[PDB]
């Protein structure tokens, strides 16, 4: 487990001015303080820190990784490799886990939505509609943290099952604000909290497709 | 006074001709419209989404070509997958820079 | 079609010559710390405004 913290300063004249004008500064500073902790937690989950030896989601050693052919090569888009790769990734989880676990969630970059919108060569429905019809139960969603997974611009896709027994994030102590410690005609309010990161418990329920 | 087309802090996209000399490309229009719709949402990060489109009154003719092997047209499919957006044409977009340069506003 | 395709507002009274609107934002950070710490990051805020005729 780990621990975080930050702080903020304010004076007395600023407090009196904020009271008399209807635009407090303390609330804005506290909002910034809380936002900073939330963003640091997100950074720990999705990127990890090297000196502290924290491993990101994409750098876990014992998970399934599949290299892929570009869904968008230079500029041409390939609707038919995406479906094949998704079906193969769905089958892999069931085959490896031997029927105990099945995929329930998919996360794609917000350009693969454009990719999966081309109409099927026949009829009018898109590839997404046919995929949902033949793969009922799976929910598809897109996040913007999957477009720069390594730092050199290579998009990735995650297929996994969501269950608190396979993966977990924990916050043993929430955001707290210690009482202000006054100085000469001004104060200092410290803040702190704790976080753990992401731990994968049965690292065979996640499949990563790299290079999309 | 700054016009709509000459304002510095707006997003501008250079496009390949929808009608080169005389040939019509009905597949570049859909790609460019989708890209322009995506840029607003990505940059404003979900607060702002495109709701209206204004095209020249001849690209209206362009977007009427029927699908190669279907009953629907490109406009119908675009509207079906992009519900909520209204497309309209105005005659003021047939000359933007004063030397015959058409444009589209999203 | 200038009036039809763009919104029309009625805030300004006839005698005004100018108007103004303001925006705000925030700045801050955080770090992983240990106990017995005196170095802690700080936050702040800032605004701006613009005019018209």
């Amino acid at each position: 487990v780990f621990r975080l913290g930050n702080a903020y300063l304010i004076s007395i004249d600023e407090i009196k001015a904020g009271q008399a004008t209807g635009r407090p500064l303390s609330t804005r500073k506290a909002s910034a303080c809380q936002l900073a902790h939330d963003q640091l937690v997100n950074r720990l989950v999705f990127k990890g820190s090297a000196p502290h030896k924290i491993v990101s989601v994409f750098n876990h050693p014992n998970i399934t990784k599949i290299t892929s052919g570009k869904w968008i090569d230079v500029s041409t888009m390939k609707p038919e490799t995406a479906e094949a790769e998704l079906t193969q990734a769905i089958e892999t989880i069931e085959t490896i886990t031997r029927g105990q676990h099945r995929a329930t969630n998919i996360l794609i970059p917000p350009s693969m939505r454009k990719v999966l919108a081309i109409r099927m060569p026949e009829t009018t429905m898109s590839y997404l509609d046919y995929f949902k019809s033949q793969n009922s139960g799976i929910e598809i969603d897109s996040i913007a943290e999957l477009e720069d997974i390594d730092g050199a611009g290579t998009k990735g896709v995650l297929v996994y099952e969501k269950n608190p027994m396979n993966m977990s994030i924990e916050i043993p102590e929430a955001f707290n604000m210690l009482p202000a410690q006054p100085k000469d005609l001004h104060f200092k309010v410290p803040c702190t909290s704790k976080c753990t990161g992401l731990t994968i418990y049965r690292p065979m329920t996640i499949v990563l497709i790299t290079g999309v | 006074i700054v016009s709509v087309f000459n304002h510095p802090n707006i997003t501008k996209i250079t496009s390949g001709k929808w009608i080169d000399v005389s040939t019509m490309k009905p597949e570049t229009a859909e790609a460019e419209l989708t890209q322009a719709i995506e840029t607003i949402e990505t940059i404003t990060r979900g607060q702002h989404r495109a709701t209206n489109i204004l095209i020249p009154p001849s690209m209206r003719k362009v977007l009427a070509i029927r699908m190669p092997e279907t009953t629907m047209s490109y406009l119908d499919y675009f509207k079906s997958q992009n519900s909520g957006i209204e497309i309209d044409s105005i005659a003021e977009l047939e000359d933007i820079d004063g030397a015959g340069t058409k444009g589209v506003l999203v | 079609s200038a009036l039809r395709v763009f919104p029309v507002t009625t805030e300004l009274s006839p005698t005004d010559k100018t108007f103004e609107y303001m925006t705000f934002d925030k700045v801050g950070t955080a770090q992983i710390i240990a106990d017995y710490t005196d170095d802690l990051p700080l936050v702040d805020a800032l605004g701006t405004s613009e005019f018209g005729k």
Partner: peptide, 28 residues
């Protein structure tokens, strides 16, 4: 170097719009 300015100041003909804009910072 005397004063010649008019009767009405620049702040008697001026309007501050009611709304203000705040930037959004999604957590993730």
């Amino acid at each position: 170097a005397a004063a010649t300015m008019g009767i009405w100041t620049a702040q008697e003909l001026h309007r501050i719009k009611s709304q203000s804009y705040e930037e959004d910072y999604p957590v993730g």
